[PDB]
Nucleic acid binder design. Sequence first.
RNA 1: CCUACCGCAGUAUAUUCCUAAACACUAUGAAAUGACCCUAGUUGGUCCAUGAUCAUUUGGGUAAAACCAUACUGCAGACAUCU
Length: 226
Amino acid sequence: VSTHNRDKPWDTDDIDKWKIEEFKEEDNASGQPFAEESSFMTLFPKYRESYLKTIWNDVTRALDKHNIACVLDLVEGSMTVKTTRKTYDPAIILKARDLIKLLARSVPFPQAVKILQDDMACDVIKIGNFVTNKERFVKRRQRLVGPNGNTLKALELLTKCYILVQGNTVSAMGPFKGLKEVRRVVEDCMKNIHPIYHIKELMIKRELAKRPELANEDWSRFLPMF
RNA sequence: CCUACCGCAGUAUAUUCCUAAACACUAUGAAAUGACCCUAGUUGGUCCAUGAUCAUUUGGGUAAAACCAUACUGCAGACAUCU
């Protein structure tokens, strides 16, 4: 219970709080370019290089839709995004910082370019840090995909997120609730908890969410403890 | 006695119509709060009546010359007096 909360008369149920209104040039009410250049840089593994070398022009055109300048440096092994004078959206650089990172973690460009949309969010979760043994790490990482990918499919339908497992990372793209659930499932899966328990928990949560009378009270007696 | 090659000088190496593009000009309107470019100025840079930069199309112009190769045509086979 939070005490010392003041009343909020302006808050009513009519406002859709989660809608994202479009940002345009007229929305930037200062009317001036960004004061100084903002840049984000990442490194990528060496096996991605040639793929990046093929797709970079396409990547450039995508950022040309948002006035973001991109630089690939194969000698350094780095990808850089930066704002220009033509840039008017303050957030669109951060999404650019996501995109190259998604490109660094084996997410394909047609999937990764959707991070430029407003409703899309991404998470890159490190899985190589939990356990030091190689065989245990391989087994727990394969538990995420499962046999014939079905467990992975069971994740992607439940959290509504595109999930790609590569190396020491898992890259998830979707809504924020789905990202939260994916992070929980992945971090528990690296801690020797099988994903099927979380899958069953999400099923029970999904069926309880349909019933309106069950919203106020606790779901703990329905949920099997694991 | 005649042909062919050889010397020199010319002609041709696609033609007509429509059309696309380039370059430059020209016709009309727009000029000093002139116009354009650059993460952009403690005083930026470039072009600008010697016509910039924009719009309509106003209309015409240029895209050669020299040589090689092939064919054709023509002129000569000339040691050069002149006083």
